[PDB]
Amino acid sequence: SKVFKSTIAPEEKLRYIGNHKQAFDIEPLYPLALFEEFVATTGDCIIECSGKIKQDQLYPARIDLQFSDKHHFHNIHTSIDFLKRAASRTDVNLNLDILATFLAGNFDYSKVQNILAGIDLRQNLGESKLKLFIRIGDYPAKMAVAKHLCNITPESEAMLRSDTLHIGFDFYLDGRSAIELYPELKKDEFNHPFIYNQLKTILSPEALKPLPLCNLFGIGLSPANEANVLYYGLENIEDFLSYFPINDTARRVHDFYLQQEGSRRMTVALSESEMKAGRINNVNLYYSKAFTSQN
Amino acid sequence: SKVFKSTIAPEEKLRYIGNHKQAFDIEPLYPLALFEEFVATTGDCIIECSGKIKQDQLYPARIDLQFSDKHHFHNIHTSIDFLKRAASRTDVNLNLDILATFLAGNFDYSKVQNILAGIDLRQNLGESKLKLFIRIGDYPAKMAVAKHLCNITPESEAMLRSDTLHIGFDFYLDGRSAIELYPELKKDEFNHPFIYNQLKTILSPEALKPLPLCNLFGIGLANVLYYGLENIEDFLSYFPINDTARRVHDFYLQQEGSRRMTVALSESEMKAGRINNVNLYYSKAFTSQ
Ligand SMILES: [Mg+2]
Ligand SMILES: [Mg+2]
């Protein structure tokens, strides 16, 4: 049968996804089945399960898979095959024109640093979307293309690093598409006094409070965002409730993953307006689990 | 290693269901896979694929199976086995006490005349339902049970016939359950002047217009009228359905199956210029040679 022998069975990955589907009553939404059999074909990877909370509404059909090897061409190729297979449904149309623009030419795949393929499915077909993430490093030509696709004003350009660029693609099943850039700072970097003091100019002290808890901090820039999204990579999931006063709907998601085996780290995404409110009512929560072979 | 040479292979039954799932992009809703495993174990039967239209919303996860042999105890038992296999998922709550009350005692299975088991699935788990239909004849003790269970109003007793009762059970996956009676008329009845004349009083002339094309007319106890068309080609003339429902009808004009179909809709939809809320039923028989 197989040729490559891992210690990770494909059932382990689908069980982690299945635990998410059971906890939050995720019934089959297109193309969840196609995404799961795509997950079963992957090698070493990290799977992120997520919940998007808007007031008392919960959207939990959010899963991302990060490839944990350096085969960038193959992993991009297989992710796009999933995008093309999902687009085979007659009443679905994916607009890949912005991804085609980014990948056009003699694309140097040796500049790719990280790849994620994901979903965010709703009961509304047109409101569901598929996702592709690509991080590139020291690639001026394609960083320029990505910046132009994002239509970043010179103010947002000052947020972007020149050594790395984290790019996300959204593909709604009704033809809508968007690009997003995620400039980030590591703990050693936003602890630099010459960087943290400038953060005091652009961000409120409420948005700066959880920084001692984080190994990563970033912002999402996209024409599709109502406002810039703040991203916090927490080092310890147990520190979350002391600094992020989420509502009960988001609390059900976080309480479930306080007891799920996997990474101790987590990610929270929310607007700066939510950080200044007394209670977080609109937020994304991300939790992950690693699947790596011991051979 | 099987036993019966006459056993129908389930492949053609499942491809008929598969053509329906493919045509309307049906997700693996629960418990569609269990129902297909149940269909695979059946013998001679009619498989009915259906679509419910609400204006521009289509719900195509609607499949029924009518047993064709007279092994009534066996077919009821296997149907209940499917009902209990579906109920075994922890987040599902199936209440079967209405069916348990009807089948209680020393049930006379020789009085059964027709059995059907089916599904009507939705994206919301609690809104999906499993179905079981039983027709009994000249069974006064159990016809009284079904009458009592339906809270039969006197003016609705005037619709039932003395020696037959078509009873349908609904089992929603959230615990809700229901039972209702289906009075019926055959073509020799609703075309006879003695019955058709007094039908002109209780029914509008628009609801009576499709009767020349029918061999079966019934009411589901707003009341829903059922039309059993003899010929699928006559449908679009007397039923101006919208384009959402036209998508289902156009598909089954091209599919192999029985030339007869069934349309279910309220009397208000008959008096409408276009038909926006309608059920469409198409079938294909599977008999052994
Ligand atoms: Mg985003
Ligand atoms: Mg009904």
B96, amino acid identity: L
The owner of tokens 């009619």 is: B46
| Residue A198 DSSP symbol | H
101-130 of B, contacting A, C-beta below 8 A: 123-125
Elucidated via: X-ray
B25 and A CB contact within 8 Å: yes
Distance CA B113, CA B69 (A): 10
Test the A interface: residue of B21, B22, B25 with most A CBs within 10 Å: B25
Burial (CB < 10 A; 0-12, 13-18, 19+), residue B86, is: buried
On chain B, the residues whose CB falls within 8 A of the CB of A25 are 91, 125
Resolution of the coordinates, Å = 2.2
B24 and A CB contact within 8 Å: no
- Dihedral through CA A16, CA A19, CA A20, CA A21, nearest 10? 120
Query: Ligand 1 mean position to A180 CA, how many Å?
Result: 6
Strands (E), chain A: 45-54, 57-67, 112-120, 129-137, 164-172, 177-181, 184-186, 214-220, 229-234, 266-271, 282-291
A 10 A CB-CB count for B166 gives: 21
- Dihedral through CA A66, CA A71, CA A72, CA A73, nearest 10? -130
Q: Which residue is closest to A30 within chain B, CA to CA?
A: B27
**Element at A257 (helix H, strand E):** helix A248-257
* A184-186 β-sheet, strand order: A177-181, A164-172, A129-137, A112-120, A57-67, A45-54, A282-291, A266-271, A229-234, A214-220, A184-186
Contact A180, A224 (CB under 8 A): yes
Contact A49, A287 (CB under 8 A): yes
| Residue B29 DSSP symbol | -
| Residue A93 DSSP symbol | B
Q: Which residue is closest to B128 within chain A, CA to CA?
A: A27
Helix, strand, or coil (residue B239): coil
Q: Which residue is closest to B122 within chain A, CA to CA?
A: A27
**Element at B45 (helix H, strand E):** strand B45-54
Contact A8, A293 (CB under 8 A): yes
Query: Ligand 1 mean position to A81 CA, how many Å?
Result: 22
B155 and A CB contact within 8 Å: no
